[PDB]
Amino acid sequence: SPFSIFHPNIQAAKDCNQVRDFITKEVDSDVNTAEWGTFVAVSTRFRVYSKYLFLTYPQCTLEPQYALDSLRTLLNKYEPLYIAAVRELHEDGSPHLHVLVQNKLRASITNPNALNLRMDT
DNA sequence: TAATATTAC
Ligand SMILES: [Mn+2]
């Protein structure tokens, strides 16, 4: 529906490598992927406190590139280093997004709606 | 976890 607000599941990513593999798992992920930055080689009430975020926007028609661009700005204070946003389909064929964000600084997310996004149509 | 939802290492 027009001008829907999209709320993500926000998690601190436990293993960025596994998350990136997981969100690029589909054979056609290449044309459904937006990327920015350089991948960080990581060394091994609501609150998330991490440099590494794994976001899932269910039932979400946002273009990966525009989700990425807007998350870069919403997370700007934490100095994003790498973002990958990928569209996949639910079983019923409707789209959703997954995003991996790697920041320089640890983000303290206490508002669960902080990464909500509205689509411009 | 909240708070979208069946998608989420
Ligand atoms: Mn998926």
Author numbering: 1 to 44, 61 to 137
What does the published report state?
HUH endonucleases are diverse enzymes that contain an eponymous motif consisting of a pair of conserved metal-coordinating histidine (H) separated by a bulky hydrophobic residue (U). Replication-initiating HUH endonucleases (Reps) are sequence-specific nucleases that cleave and rejoin single-stranded DNA (ssDNA) during rolling-circle replication. Replication initiator proteins (Reps) from this HUH endonuclease superfamily are found in a variety of bacterial plasmids and viral genomes, including circular Rep-encoding single-stranded DNA (CRESS-DNA) viruses that are known to infect organisms across all three domains of life (1–5). These enzymes initiate rolling-circle replication through sequence-specific processing of the viral single-stranded DNA (ssDNA) genome via cleavage and subsequent phosphotyrosine covalent linkage to the ssDNA’s newly exposed 5′ end. Following linkage, the genome’s freed 3′-OH can be used as a primer for DNA replication before its ultimate return to the active site, where it attacks the phosphotyrosine intermediate to rejoin and release the circular ssDNA genome.
The first cocrystal structures of viral Reps in complex with their specific substrates provided insight into their mechanisms of DNA recognition. Strikingly, the ssDNA conforms into a distinct U shape around a key topologically stabilizing motif in the Rep called the single-stranded DNA bridging motif (sDBM). A common feature across all structures of CRESS-DNA viral Reps in complex with their ssDNA substrates elucidated thus far is an intramolecular WC base pair between the −4T and +1A positions with respect to the cleavage site.
